[PDB]
C-alpha cells in the first residue's frame, strides 16, 4: 500500500515558476515508477511522464520536454516536478501516481495561471423585467461578473432559500471569471418578501444585492 | 503483495516475508526490505530463499533454542506445498511490466 | 637302518617391533585438510599418417591368408597391436596391404571368420567431428557411443563400433588385392 | 551480521553472530550467494529441466541386518585417541573400541564433498564435512571415479572425458533419507530417488544429456545394488565386492579395463563397502564396537584396499584408524606365532585378521608368516590327503594367506625358511582334486575359486591342456565358463609375469632355464629342483624313468641352498628301488621327507610332505600305494639329498 | 500513437442495473507474451482517479466483486454488476505497452430518470450594469433531462453566435436533473440597436423549441 502527498495549489503568473512535490509513504517494490498526468476541467487524462527516483531514467512525450522537467529526491522520495513558461491552455490539475498501473494516485495539485490581478466581483440582479408574467413561481437570479481568482460562494437571504437554488460553474471571459445563480420562488413570496443575493469572494469582499423590478 | 523477480547482499536485511501457494496461484515469492518512511522491498525467489534457510537450521541442529526447532518443520511442508511441476505451461511473466 | 626323525615345526620368529606409544595423530595422517583428486587427461589427437596409406600394387598369396572374398585377400594379424599402430603392422605384414574398413556388403564376411570371444580392429576412423571413412573412402554408419576416433568389430557387429581407449591390444583387419 | 525476522502466513526471528559463532564455520553469505535469491522463475525452471529426474518407487521393503553386536560382557573399552600400553591383553579378553574416538580417526580428514562444478552446483549447496574417499582413474585418466563419503551418506561420482574434451558426469548418492545432503533451489528428493527403503534411499544426480551418454554402455541394476547395500553386513558385503575384483584381476580384467555396466557397477560397490563399515560405527549413538567385529570388517577393507590398488591404482584416504592398528599390534605380542595353529579355529582367524590390520603391508614384522605357517601346518596334518580342502579350512587359509602374499611382493626374501615351508605345504595341498574344485568354483563363481593353496604353491608344471583334464566334465555346466576357469586359473600362476611366484628361495638362482622348472620341494637343509632341465647347478642329478616322448624328469638336490660351480657331468644317477619296507610303521621314519607320485606320460600327479606321524599313517594304511599301474612311480626325497623309488612292500 | 475508443460516452443507469463499457484499441496489446496491459480507472466526482482493473481483468485491492474486466487482443469490455451510488463517475481506460500510454474518452456513468423539459427564463440587462457601459442578457435553462440541449440566440430574428458564454451543471444530487445558464454579453451601445432578444431552447421532450424573449420597452 502506497499513499502520496502533493503540494498545495499555487496561483502563478504566466512565466513564473511552480514546483510541485509528490511524497511517497508506504510499502512498494524496487525500481518503482512515479507517473504524472494532467486534465483540464471537464476533459480527460493525457500524458504519462514517468520517472524512477532510484534509476533516475525518465520517459516524457513530444510535450513536457522544455515544457517540463522531472527531478527526484532519494532521501525521502519526493519526485519533484516544475514548469515555468506556461500558457493559458495548461492551467489544469496535475496528478501524481505510483505504480506501473498506475496503482496509487495523489490528491493532485491545481495550478491556475493568468496575468490577472485580484478583482472583486460585480453583482447585478436578474429580475424578470416588465412585460413578463411568471405565474405560479417566479425564477430570479444573480449575476457575478469580472472577478479573480476563484472561487466565490453565492447564498440567498443568508443561508435561507436552500432548495431550488442553482449556482453555475465559472466561465472565463476577458481573462476574468463570471457566473450566475438562480432561485425558484413562489410568486406569493415575492416581492412580498425581500429576496437578496449574498456573493462572497474571500480573496477580498462580499457584495449584497437586492432583487427589484 | 506479490511481485516479479528481476535482477544488496545479506546483512542489511531486517525482515523477510514469504507467501503461501494460494496467495499467488502457486508461485513462491519473498520480500526483502530494510528497516514518512516508505520502505522499498527487494523481491526474491521463494523456493531458493526457503531452501536457503532450511539448510541453515539443519547445519546448526546443535544450536537450536527450541524456538528454531519449530521453525525448521514449518519451513518444510510449506516447501513441498509448492508444486514445481504444473509450472512449465504457466505464464512466468504474470507479474512483469517491462518499462 | 631307518633312524626315526622328528615332526616338522615352524622356525622361531623374532618378537614384534615395539610400537608407539608416541607419535601424534598429525604424524600419522597429513594436514587434515584435503582436496579431492582431479585428473588432467592428456588427450592425443590423431590424423592419417599418409605413410602408410592404401597400397598401390595388387599382390596376394594363397597359402597364408585368412580368407578371400571376391578379389580381396584378407589377413588377421597374429600379433596384438594398438589401433593407431596397425597402419604400420600391416604395411610391413605382406606386400601391398593396408588397414581395411569393412563395407556393409563385406562386414558380414569378416564377422563369420571370428570366434565368439575375440575382437578385431578395423580401418574406419573419424578425422574430426564428421563423416567416418576408411582408406578407400566412403560413408560408414558407425555405432558411436564414446569419444570416437577408432573402431573395432566383433562376431555380432552389424556396423563398426567405437572404442573408449584405443591403446588396447587387438588383432587387426588388413586386406590385399 | 545481524538478526533477521522471518514471517509467513506468525513470525520468527533467526539470530546470527549468536548461533553462528556457537556452530562453526557457518557462512550465511556464500550460501545466500549460492541459493540465488534473485533468480527469475524462467531461469529457475530452465535449471530444473536440465537435471535428470526419475519415475520414483513405491516401496521395496528391506531389512537392515544385525551387523555390530551388543557390548560383549565385561569388555575393556578402548579409546583410539589414548591407546596406552595398559594391559588389554590376550585374544580371549573381551575388548571394544569407543565409537566416538574411533570415528574421529576414520573421518580425520576434511574437504568439500559437493563441488561447485556442474551439474552439482545446480542441485546441491556446497558441503564441507569430515570425509573419506576412494578414488581411481583409467584409460589414461579419461575415466575417473571418486567415492566420497561420511558416516551418514555416500556419493560416488563418475566422470568421462571424450576426445573433444566434453566431460560427462553422473553421481550416485546412498544413505539414510534423513541424512541426505541439503537440496538447493526447487529440487525435491522423491523426484531423484531411484530406489527407496524404510530409512535408506539411492539418489541419482546428473543431466538429461549426460545420462543419455552413460546409458549407451552403463545400465545399472540400481534395484539390485540397493538391495545388496542395505540387506548385507559390512564384512559380508565387502567380501562380495572382493571376490568380484579378485576373479576379475585374473582373466584379464583390469590390465585393459572396460567401460562395462559390470565394471562401472563394481567401482561404486567398492565405495559402499568402505561406507558400510564407517556407517555402522557412526550409527551407534555414543557406544563401543566389539573388537572381533572390527577385526573382521577392517581385514576385508585391508584386503579390498590392496586389490583396488593393484588393479586400478585406486587410492583410499580415510577409513584407517591408527588406534586400531595399535591395538591389533599389542594383541599380537601376547600369542606365540610359532604355535598359532594350535589355537581354536575361531581364535586362529581372529589373530590372523589382527595380524593384517595391525601390520599393514608386511616387510616390517616378518614374524607374521610364522603364524600363517603354523596355521597351514596345523591344518595340513589334520586334512585328509589329496582331498579338495574344505569350506571352513579354505576360509581360514584365505585369511592367513594375505600376510604371505604381501611378502612375496617384496623382492627381498623376508625371512626365507618359514616362507618356503608355507609354500611347500601349499604345494602338497594342490592335488588333482583340489584343482578340479577350484575350477568348479570359477565356473560357478562360488567361494571355492576365491582362494586355493595351489595359487601360492611351488608347482609350475600346470599347463592349459593339463588343467583341462582335471576340469568338471558335467554336461549341465556352461562349456564356456569351464574353458575360462582354466584360463583364469592358469593366469594366476604365471612365472615371469605376475611377480608373486618365485625368486625368494636361494635355490632358484641355481637353475639355467626357468620355464623348464616343474616343482620345487624345500626341505630342511636341502631343496630339490624337479625340472626337465639337464643343466641345473645342484649337487647331484637323478633321472626318473620318463618314457619316450615327454621332455625328461630330473631331480637336482641343492644342499643347504648353495649352488655348484656347474652342472654335474656324466650320465645322471639312477633312482634306487626299495622293496624291503613294510606297510606297518609305529614311528617316523619319513618325517621331513617328501613323497612324489608321477606318471611316466602325464607327469607329476601328487605331492606329499611327511610332516608328522598322522600324515605318514595316512600314506601307508590308505590305498595310496597302487603298483597296479606300471606307468606310475613313487619317489622318496630325503633330507640327506637322496632320491629313492618305492617299488613294493612286504 | 495508440488511439483508444470508449463507448458510450454517457451511460445513464438506474441503481441496480448492469453497465458495460468497451475500450477498443488501435494496436494489439500483447507483450511478454500474453500479458495484456489494459487498465480501468474510476474518477468519482471531485476526487482523484483510482485504479479498478489492471491487466485486462484483475480486481485491484479494495474493489468489490461487481467489477469485472473482459475481452482480449484489441477489443475489451468492463462490466458493473448491480450499480451502486458510489460507482457513479467517469471510467477511463489505458494501455501501458507502447510509449505513450494514452487514456480513453471517459464514459460518464449517470443516473437515469424521467424526461423533464427545461424551464426557460430570460432576464434583460440590469440597470446597474448599463451604468457601467455594458449589457449582458441571461437565460436560465433549469431542471431538464437528458443533459443534451442547445440554445439559439435570435436578435430581431437573426441568429447570434458571437459573445455567448454557456455553463452547465452536474446532475443534481436530489432532482437528478441538469441546468444551464447562457449569458450573452454585449455593449451598452450595441445593445441599444436591436429590440427583440430571444432565447430558444431545443430539447428532446419538445419537438418545438421553447422561446422566451423580450422587447426593449
Ligand atoms: C498448496 O497447494 C496444494 C495443491 O494445490 C495443496 O495440497 C493438498 O494437501 C492435502 C492434504 O492436506 C492432500 O490431500 C493433497 O496433497 C492436496 N489436496 C488435494 C485435494 O489434492 C495445499 O493444500 C495447498 N496449501 C493450502 C494451505 O491449502
Ligand atoms: C542467479 O540467478 C541467475 C538467473 O539467470 C543465474 O543465471 C544465468 O547466469 C549465467 C552466468 O552464470 C548467465 O550467463 C546467464 O545470462 C544467466 N541467465 C539469465 C536469464 O540471466 C545465475 O547463475 C545466478 N547468479 C550467478 C552469479 O550465477
Q: Where are the domains of chain B?
A: 1-99
Distance CA D370, CA D421 (A): 10
Instruction: Give bridge partners of residue D554 from the DSSP assignment.
Output: D531, D543
Q: Is A53 exposed, middle or buried (0-12, 13-18, 19+ CB in 10 A)?
A: buried
Angstrom distances, CA of residue E189 to CA of A8, C56, E122, E213: 44, 127, 20, 20
How many CA atoms within 13 Å lie on the side-chain side of B89?
A: 1
Cβ atoms of residues E25 and B82 within 8 Å: no
Q: How many Cα atoms sit within 13 Å of A185 on the Cβ side?
A: 23
What is the residue whose three cell numbers read 616343474?
A: D518
d(CA A180, CA D623): 149
Chains A and B, touching by 3 or more CB pairs within 8 angstroms: yes
Spatial distance between the Cα atoms of E118 and E149, rounded to a whole number of angstroms: 9
| Per-residue DSSP letter, E172 | P
Q: Which three cell numbers stand for residue B1?
A: 503483495
The domain at E1-113 falls in which architecture? Sandwich (2.60)
Spatial distance between the Cα atoms of D42 and B91, rounded to a whole number of angstroms: 9
Q: Which residues pair with B42 in a beta bridge?
A: B32
Do residues D280 and D234 lie in contact, with contact meaning Cβ atoms separated by under 8 Å?
A: yes
Instruction: Give the CATH H-level superfamily of domain B1-99.
Output: Viral glycoprotein L (3.10.390.20)
Rg (CA), chain C: 28
Residues whose CB falls within 8 Å of the CB of residue D133, separated by 6 or more in sequence, listed in order = C34, C36, C37, D111, D146, D147, D148, D149, D316, D317, D318
E90-121: burial string, b at 16+ Cβ within 10 Å, e else: bbbbbbbbeebbbbbbbbbbbbeeeebbbbbb
Cβ neighbours of residue D497 closer than 8 Å, sequence gap 6 or more? none
Q: By the 8 A CB rule, do D612 and D631 touch?
A: no
Close Cβ partners of A109 (under 8 Å, ≥ 6 residues apart): A6, A7, A8, A9, A10, A20, A93, A94
Alpha helices (H) along D7-71: 30-35, 41-48
C-alpha cell, D253: 580384467
Q: How far apart are CA D97 and CA D325, in angstroms?
A: 12
Resolution (A): 3.1
Asked whether D551 lines ligand 2 (CB < 6 A), one says no
Q: Roughly what angle, to the nearest 10 degrees, separates helices D391-409 and D368-382?
A: 150
φ, ψ of residue D643 to 5 degrees: the values are: -125, 145
- What phi, psi does C91 have (nearest 5°)? -55, -25
> What pairing do the DSSP bridges indicate for beta strands D554-559 and D526-531?
antiparallel
Residue D252 corresponds to which cell in the numbers above? Answer: 584379464
Using alpha carbons, select from C105, C104, C134 the residue that is nearest to residue C121.
Answer: C134
Do the Cβ atoms of D350 and D91 come closer than 8 Å?
yes
C-alpha distance from residue E212 to each of A180, B28, E129, E141, E151 (Å): 18, 72, 21, 11, 11
> Which of A97, A143, A135 minimizes the C-alpha distance to A4?
A97
Helices D391-409, D291-312: axis angle to 10 degrees equals: 50
Neighbours of chain D (3+ CB pairs under 8 A): B, C
Compute the nearest-CA separation of B85 from chain E (Å): 21
Q: Are D78 and D96 in contact (CB under 8 A)?
A: yes
Which sequence spans correspond to the domains of chain E? 1-113, 114-216
In sequence order, what are the residues at sequence separation of 6 or more whose Cβ sits closer than 8 angstroms to the Cβ of residue D235? D296, D297, D300
Query: Cβ A28–B99 below 8 Å, yes or no?
Result: no
Q: Which of A81, A63, A64 is nearest to A72 (CA)?
A: A81
Cis peptide before A22 (omega within 30 of 0): no
Indicate the helix (H) or strand (E) that contains D326: helix D322-331
Cβ of D36 closer than 6 Å to ligand 2, yes or no, is yes
Gap between the Cα atoms of D247 and D484, Å rounded:
11
The alpha-helical segments, DSSP class H, found in D595-636 are: 613-621
Q: Where are the beta strands (DSSP E) in chain E?
A: 4-7, 10-13, 18-25, 38-43, 50-54, 58-59, 67-72, 75-81, 89-95, 108-111, 119-123, 134-144, 150-155, 158-160, 164-168, 178-187, 196-202, 210-215
- What are the residue boundaries of the structural domains of chain A, listed by start? 1-116, 117-213
Is the minimum distance from the CB of B21 to ligand 1 under 6 angstroms? yes
Note whether E126 contacts A126, CB cutoff 8 Å.
Answer: yes
Query: Residue E199 pairs with which residues in a beta bridge?
Result: E153, E212
Question: In sequence order, which ranges of D383-495 are alpha helices (DSSP H)?
Answer: 391-409, 416-428, 432-444, 464-469, 479-492
Contact indicator for E46, E84 with CB cutoff of 8 Å = no
Cβ–Cβ contact B92 with D under 8 A: yes
Classify the C-alpha dihedral E197-E201-E202-E205 as positive or negative: negative
Q: Whole-angstrom distance between the N-terminal and C-terminal Cα of chain B? A: 20
Check the CA dihedral D564-D566-D570-D576 and report its sign.
positive
Testing ligand 2's pocket by substitution, the residue of D43, D44, D119 carrying the most ligand atoms inside 8 A of its CB is D43
Cα(D220)–Cα(D227) distance, rounded to whole angstroms? 13
- CA-nearest residue for atom 25, ligand 2, is D36
Torsion (CA) D220, D221, D225, D228 in degrees, nearest 10: -160
Question: How many angstroms separate the alpha carbon of residue D155 from the centre of ligand 2?
Answer: 27
Find chain D residues with C-beta within 8 A of B10's C-beta: 4, 28-29, 32
Which of these CATH numbers, 3.90.380.20, 1.10.3720.10, 3.40.50.300, 3.40.50.720, describes D1-320? Answer: 3.90.380.20
Closest CA to D462 of D425, D427, D512, D423: D427
Long-range CB contact pairs, D261-266, < 8 A, 24+: D261/D217, D261/D218, D261/D219, D261/D220, D261/D221, D264/D145, D264/D158, D264/D218, D264/D220, D265/D220, D265/D221, D265/D225, D266/D241
- Decide if E33 touches B, using CB distance below 8 A: yes
Ramachandran region of residue A15, left (φ > 0), alpha (ψ -120 to 50) or beta?
A: left
DSSP designation for D384? P
The string of DSSP letters for chain A reads -EEEEEPPPEEE-TTS-EEE-EEEEEEEETT--EEEEEE-TT------EEE-TTT--EE--SSSSSS-EE---TTTT---EEE-S--STT-EEEEEEETTTT-EE---EEEEE-S---BPPEEEEE---SS----SEEEEEEEEEEEBSS--EEEESTT---TTEEEPPPEEETTEEEEEEEEEEEGGGSSSS--EEEEE-TTS-EEEEE---
Q: What angle do CA D552, D557, D560 make, to 5 degrees?
A: 155
Ligand 1 atom with the shortest distance to the CA of B21: 1
- Closest residue, chain D, to B60 (C-alpha): D23
Q: Under a CB-based contact definition with an 8 Å cutoff, are residues A184 and A174 in contact?
A: no
With b for 16 or more beta-carbon neighbours within 10 A and e for fewer, the C29-66 pattern comes to beeeebeeeebebeeeeeeeeeebeebeeeebeeeebe
**What is the rounded distance in angstroms from the CA atom of residue D324 to the CA atom of residue D158?**
32
Alpha-carbon gap, residue E24 to E43, rounded angstroms: 20
The CA distance from C78 to C85, in Å, is: 14
Contacts of E108 (CB under 8 A, 6+ apart): E9, E10, E11, E89, E90
CA B81-B84-B88 angle, 5° bins: 145
Q: Note whether B touches D: 3 CB pairs or more under 8 A.
A: yes
Cα-Cα-Cα-Cα torsion D427, D433, D437, D443, nearest 10 degrees, comes to 100
d(CA D566, CA D80): 58
The SS3 call for residue E142 is strand
Distance of CA B1 to the CA centre of its chain: 12
Q: Suggest the residue from A2, A5, A34, A44 to mutate for an interface test with chain E (most E CBs closer than 10 A).
A: A44
Tell me, using a 6 A CB cutoff, whether residue B41 lines ligand 1. no
C-alpha to C-alpha distance for D428 and D523, rounded to whole angstroms: 12
Q: What is chain E's alpha carbon radius of gyration, rounded to the nearest angstrom?
A: 23
Long-range contacts of C15-21 (CB under 8 A, 24+ apart): C15/D333, C15/D367, C16/D329, C16/D332, C16/D333, C16/D359, C16/D365, C16/D367, C17/D329, C17/D364, C17/D365, C19/D326, C19/D329, C19/D330, C21/D84, C21/D85, C21/D326
Cβ(C170)–Cβ(C81) below 8 Å: yes
Assigned C-alpha cell, D181: 545432503
Give the SS3 label for residue D553: coil
Mutation to test the E interface, candidates B23, B98, B99, most E Cβ within 10 Å: B98
DSSP string spanning D124-144? B---EEE-EEEEEEETTTTEE
Residues in chain E: 217
Grid cell for residue D87? 594391559
Size of interface A-E (CB pairs under 8 A): 117
Is B15 part of the contact surface with chain D (CB cutoff 8 Å)?
Answer: yes
Q: Using the 8-state DSSP alphabet, how is residue C6 labeled?
A: P
**CATH of the domain spanning E114-216:** 2.60.40.10
- Tell whether C164 lies on the interface with D, counting CB pairs under 8 A: yes
B32 touches chain D (CB under 8 A): yes
* 3-state class (DSSP) for residue D632: strand
| Nearest of D354, D358, D356 to residue D346 by alpha carbon | D354
Residue A5, C-alpha cell as written in the block: 502527498
Pairing of the two strands E4-7 and E58-59 = unpaired
Residue pair D376/D425 in contact by the 8 Å Cβ criterion: yes
Q: d(Cα D239, Cα D223) in Å, to the nearest integer?
A: 20
Rounded CA-CA distance B49/A76 in Å is: 29
Query: What does the block give as the cell for D403?
Result: 600376510
Determine phi and psi for A156, rounding to 5 degrees. Answer: -125, 130
Provide the CATH topology of domain A117-213.
Immunoglobulin-like (2.60.40)
Q: E99-103: list long-range contacts, CB under 8 Å, 24+ apart.
A: E99/A48, E99/A59, E99/A61, E100/A47, E100/A48, E100/A61, E100/E1, E100/E2, E101/A48, E102/A48, E102/E1, E102/E2, E102/E3, E102/E4, E103/A37, E103/A44, E103/A45, E103/A46, E103/E4
8 A C-beta contact, residue E20 and residue E79: yes
List the single residue in B with minimal CA-CA distance to D185.
B48
Q: Which residue has the cell 413570496?
A: A189
Q: Do B10 and D45 touch (CB under 8 A)?
A: no
- The residue whose CA is least distant from atom 18 of ligand 2 is D43
**For E103-152, where are the alpha helices, taking DSSP H only?**
127-131
User: Shortest CA distance to C172 belongs to which of C138, C125, C127, C137?
Assistant: C125
Nearest CA to CA, how far is A206 from chain E (Å)? 17
Q: Are strands E119-123 and A81-83 parallel, antiparallel or unpaired?
A: unpaired
Q: Does C contact E via 3+ CB–CB distances below 8 Å?
A: no
Q: Which fold has domain A1-116?
A: Immunoglobulin-like (2.60.40)
Q: Number of B to D CB contacts under 8 A, please give it.
A: 128
Distance of CA A49 to the CA centre of its chain: 23
Largest distance between two CA atoms of chain B: 48
| CA D54 to chain centroid | 36
What residues of chain C lie within 8 A of the CB of D258, using their CB? Answer: 164
How do the domains of chain D map onto residue ranges? 1-320, 321-650
Q: Which residue, E129, E168, E122, is CA-closest to A139?
A: E122
CB < 8 Å from D in window 41-100 of C: 41-43, 45
Phi, psi values for residue A137, rounded to 5°: -145, 130
CA pair distance C9, D377, nearest whole angstrom: 8
Identify the three-state secondary structure at position D331. helix
Provide DSSP, D145-157. Answer: EEEEE-SSEEEEE
Q: Contact, A2 vs A26, CB < 8 A?
A: yes
Amino acid at each position: 500500500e502506497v499513499q502520496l502527498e502533493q503540494s498545495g495549489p499555487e496561483l502563478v503568473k504566466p512565466g513564473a515558476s511552480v514546483k510541485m512535490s509528490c511524497k511517497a509513504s508506504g510499502y512498494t517494490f524496487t525500481d518503482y515508477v512515479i507517473s504524472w498526468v494532467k486534465q483540464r476541467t471537464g476533459q480527460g487524462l493525457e500524458w504519462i511522464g514517468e520517472i524512477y527516483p532510484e534509476s533516475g531514467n525518465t520517459y516524457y512525450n513530444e510535450k513536457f520536454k522544455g515544457e517540463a522537467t522531472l527531478t527526484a529526491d532519494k532521501s525521502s522520495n519526493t519526485a519533484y516536478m516544475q514548469l515555468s513558461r506556461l500558457t493559458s491552455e495548461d492551467s489544469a490539475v496535475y496528478f501524481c501516481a505510483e505504480g506501473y498501473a498506475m496503482d496509487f494516485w495523489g490528491q493532485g495539485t491545481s495550478v491556475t495561471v493568468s496575468s490577472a490581478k485580484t478583482t472583486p466581483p460585480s453583482v447585478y440582479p436578474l429580475a424578470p423585467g416588465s412585460a413578463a408574467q411568471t405565474n405560479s413561481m417566479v425564477t430570479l437570479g444573480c449575476l457575478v461578473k469580472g472577478y479573480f481568482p476563484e472561487p466565490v460562494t453565492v447564498t440567498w437571504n443568508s443561508g435561507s432559500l436552500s432548495s431550488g437554488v442553482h449556482t453555475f460553474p465559472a466561465v472565463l471571459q476577458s481573462d476574468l471569471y463570471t457566473l450566475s445563480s438562480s432561485v425558484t420562488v413562489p410568486s406569493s413570496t415575492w416581492p412580498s418578501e425581500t429576496v437578496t443575493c449574498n456573493v462572497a469572494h474571500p480573496a477580498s469582499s462580499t457584495k449584497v444585492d437586492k432583487k427589484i423590478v | 503483495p506479490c511481485c516479479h523477480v528481476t535482477q544488496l547482499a545479506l546483512e542489511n536485511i531486517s525482515d523477510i516475508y514469504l507467501v503461501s501457494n494460494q496467495t499467488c496461484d502457486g508461485f513462491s515469492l519473498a520480500s526483502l526490505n530494510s528497516p514518512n518512511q516508505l520502505v522499498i522491498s527487494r523481491c526474491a525467489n521463494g523456493l531458493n530463499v526457503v531452501s536457503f534457510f532450511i539448510s541453515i537450521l539443519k547445519r546448526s541442529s546443535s544450536a537450536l533454542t527450541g524456538h528454531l526447532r519449530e521453525l525448521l518443520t514449518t519451513l518444510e511442508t510449506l516447501y513441498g506445498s509448492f508444486s514445481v511441476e504444473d509450472l512449465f505451461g504457466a505464464n512466468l511473466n504474470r507479474y512483469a511490466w517491462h518499462r | 637302518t631307518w633312524v626315526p626323525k622328528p615332526n616338522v615345526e615352524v622356525w622361531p620368529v623374532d618378537p614384534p617391533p615395539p610400537v608407539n606409544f608416541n607419535k601424534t595423530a598429525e604424524q600419522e595422517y597429513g594436514d587434515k585438510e584435503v582436496k579431492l583428486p582431479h585428473w588432467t587427461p592428456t588427450l592425443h589427437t590423431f590424423q592419417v599418417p599418409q605413410n602408410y596409406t592404401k597400397a598401390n600394387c595388387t599382390y596376394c598369396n594363397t597359402r597364408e591368408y585368412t580368407f578371400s572374398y571376391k578379389g580381396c585377400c584378407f589377413y588377421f594379424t597374429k600379433k596384438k597391436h594398438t589401433w593407431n599402430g596397425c597402419f604400420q603392422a600391416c604395411a610391413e605384414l605382406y606386400p601391398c596391404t593396408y588397414f581395411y574398413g569393412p563395407t556393409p556388403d563385406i562386414l558380414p564376411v569378416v564377422t563369420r571368420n571370428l570366434n565368439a570371444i575375440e575382437s578385431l580392429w578395423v580401418g574406419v576412423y573419424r578425422v574430426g567431428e564428421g563423416n567416418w571413412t576408411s582408406l578407400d573412402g566412403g560413408t560408414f554408419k558407425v555405432y558411436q557411443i564414446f569419444g570416437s576416433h577408432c573402431t573395432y568389430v566383433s562376431k555380432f557387429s552389424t556396423v563398426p563400433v567405437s572404442h573408449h581407449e584405443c591403446s588396447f591390444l587387438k588383432p587387426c583387419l588388413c586386406v590385399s588385392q | 551480521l545481524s538478526e533477521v525476522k522471518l514471517h509467513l502466513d506468525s513470525h520468527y526471528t533467526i539470530p546470527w553472530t549468536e548461533l553462528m559463532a556457537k556452530v562453526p564455520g557457518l557462512s550465511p553469505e556464500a550460501l545466500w550467494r549460492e541459493a540465488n535469491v534473485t533468480e527469475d522463475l524462467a531461469s529457475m525452471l530452465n535449471r530444473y529441466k536440465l537435471i535428470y529426474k526419475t519415475s520414483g518407487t513405491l516401496g521395496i521393503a528391506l531389512a537392515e541386518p544385525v551387523d555390530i553386536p551388543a557390548v560383549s560382557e565385561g569388555s575393556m573399552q578402548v579409546d583410539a585417541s589414548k591407546v596406552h600400553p595398559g594391559v588389554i591383553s590376550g585374544l580371549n579378553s573381551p575388548a571394544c573400541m569407543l565409537s566416538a574416538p574411533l570415528e574421529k580417526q576414520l573421518f580425520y580428514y576434511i574437504g568439500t564433498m559437493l563441488p561447485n562444478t556442474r551439474p552439482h552446483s545446480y542441485v546441491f549447496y556446497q558441503l564441507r564435512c569430515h570425509l573419506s574417499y576412494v578414488a581411481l582413474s583409467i584409460n589414461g585418466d579419461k575415466f575417473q571415479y571418486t567415492g566420497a563419503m561420511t558416516s551418514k551418506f555416500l556419493m560416488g561420482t563418475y566422470k568421462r572425458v571424450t576426445e573433444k574434451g566434453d566431460e560427462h558426469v553422473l553421481s550416485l548418492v546412498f544413505g539414510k533419507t534423513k541424512d541426505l545432503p541439503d537440496l538447493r533451489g526447487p529440487f525435491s528428493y522423491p523426484s531423484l530417488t531411484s530406489a527407496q527403503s524404510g530409512d535408506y534411499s539411492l539418489v541419482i544426480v546428473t543431466t538429461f544429456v549426460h545420462y543419455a551418454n552413460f546409458h549407451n554402455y552403463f545400465v545399472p541394476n540400481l534395484k539390485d545394488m540397493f538391495s545388496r547395500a542395505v540387506t548385507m553386513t559390512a564384512a559380508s558385503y565387502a567380501r562380495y565386492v572382493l571376490q568380484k575384483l579378485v576373479l576379475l584381476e585374473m582373466k584379464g580384467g583390469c590390465r585393459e579395463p572396460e567401460l562395462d555396466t559390470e565394471t562401472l557397477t563394481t567401482m561404486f560397490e567398492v565405495s559402499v563397502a568402505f561406507f558400510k563399515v564407517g556407517h555402522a560405527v557412526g550409527e551407534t549413538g555414543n557406544g563401543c564396537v566389539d573388537l572381533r567385529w572390527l577385526a573382521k570388517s577392517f581385514f576385508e577393507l585391508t584386503v579390498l584396499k590392496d586389490i583396488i590398488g593393484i588393479c586400478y591404482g585406486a587410492t583410499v584416504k580415510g577409513m584407517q584408524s591408527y588406534g586400531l592398528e595399535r591395538l591389533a599390534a599389542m594383541l599380537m605380542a601376547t600369542v606365540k606365532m610359532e604355535e598359532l595353529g594350535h589355537l581354536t579355529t575361531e581364535k586362529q582367524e581372529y589373530a590372523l585378521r589382527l595380524a593384517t590390520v595391525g601390520y599393514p603391508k608386511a616387510g616390517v614384522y616378518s614374524g607374521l608368516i610364522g603364524g600363517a605357517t603354523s596355521v597351514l601346518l596345523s591344518a595340513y596334518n589334520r586334512h585328509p590327503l589329496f582331498q579338495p580342502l574344505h569350506t571352513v579350512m579354505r576360509e581360514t587359509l584365505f585369511i592367513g594367506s594375505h600376510v604371505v602374499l604381501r611378502e612375496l611382493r617384496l623382492n627381498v626374501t623376508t625371512q626365507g625358511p618359514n616362507l618356503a615351508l608355507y609354500q611347500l605345504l601349499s604345494t602338497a595341498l594342490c592335488s588333482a582334486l583340489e584343482i578340479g574344485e577350484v575350477l568348479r568354483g570359477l565356473a560357478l563363481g562360488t567361494e571355492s575359486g576365491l582362494f586355493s593353496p595351489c595359487y601360492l604353491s611351488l608347482r609350475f608344471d600346470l599347463t592349459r591342456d593339463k588343467l583341462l583334464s582335471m576340469a568338471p566334465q558335467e554336461a549341465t555346466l556352461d562349456q564356456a565358463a569351464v574353458s575360462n576357469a582354466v584360463d583364469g586359473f592358469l593366469g594366476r600362476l604365471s612365472l615371469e609375469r605376475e611377480d608373486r611366484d618365485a625368486w625368494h628361495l636361494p635355490a632358484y638362482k641355481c637353475v639355467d632355464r626357468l620355464d623348464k622348472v616343474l616343482m620345487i620341494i624345500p626341505l630342511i637343509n636341502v631343496t630339490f629342483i624337479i625340472s626337465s632341465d639337464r643343466e641345473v647347478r645342484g649337487s647331484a642329478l637323478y633321472e626318473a624313468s620318463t618314457t619316450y616322448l615327454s621332455s625328461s624328469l630330473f631331480l637336482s638336490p641343492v644342499i643347504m641352498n648353495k649352488c655348484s660351480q656347474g652342472a654335474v657331468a656324466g650320465e645322471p644317477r639312477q633312482i634306487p628301488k626299495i622293496q624291503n619296507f613294510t606297510r606297518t610303521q609305529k614311528s617316523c621314519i619319513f618325517c621331513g621327507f617328501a613323497l612324489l607320485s608321477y606318471d611316466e606320460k602325464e607327469g607329476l600327479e601328487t605331492t606329499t610332505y611327511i610332516t608328522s606321524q598322522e600324515v605318514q599313517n595316512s600314506i601307508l594304511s590308505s590305498n595310496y600305494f597302487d603298483f597296479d599301474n606300471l606307468h606310475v612311480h613313487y619317489l622318496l626325497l630325503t633330507t640327506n639329498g637322496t632320491v629313492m623309488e618305492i617299488a613294493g612292500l612286504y | 500513437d495508440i488511439v483508444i475508443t470508449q463507448t458510450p460516452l454517457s451511460l445513464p443507469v438506474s441503481l441496480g442495473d448492469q453497465a458495460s463499457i468497451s475500450c477498443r484499441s488501435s494496436q494489439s496489446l500483447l507483450h511478454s507474451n500474453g500479458n495484456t496491459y489494459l487498465h480501468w480507472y474510476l474518477q468519482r466526482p471531485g476526487q482523484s482517479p483510482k485504479l479498478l482493473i489492471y491487466k485486462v481483468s484483475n480486481r485491484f485491492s479494495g474493489v468489490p466483486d461487481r467489477f469485472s474486466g473482459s475481452g482480449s487482443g484489441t477489443d475489451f469490455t468492463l462490466m458493473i454488476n448491480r450499480v451502486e451510488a458510489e460507482d457513479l463517475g467517469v471510467y477511463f481506460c489505458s494501455q501501458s505497452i507502447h510509449v505513450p500510454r494514452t487514456f480513453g474518452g471517459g464514459t460518464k456513468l449517470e443516473i437515469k430518470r424521467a424526461d423533464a423539459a427545461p424551464t426557460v427564463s430570460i432576464f434583460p440587462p440590469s440597470s446597474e450594469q448599463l451604468t457601467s457601459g455594458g449589457a449582458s442578457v441571461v437565460c436560465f435553462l433549469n431542471n431538464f433531462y437528458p443533459k443534451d440541449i442547445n440554445v439559439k440566440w435570435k436578435i430581431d430574428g437573426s441568429e447570434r453566435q458571437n459573445g455567448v458564454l454557456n455553463s452547465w451543471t452536474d446532475q443534481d444530487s436530489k432532482d437528478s436533473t441538469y441546468s444551464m445558464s447562457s449569458t450573452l454579453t454585449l455593449t451598452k451601445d450595441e445593445y441599444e440597436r436591436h429590440n427583440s432578444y430571444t432565447c430558444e431552447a431545443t430539447h428532446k421532450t419538445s419537438t418545438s423549441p421553447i422561446v422566451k424573449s423580450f422587447n426593449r420597452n
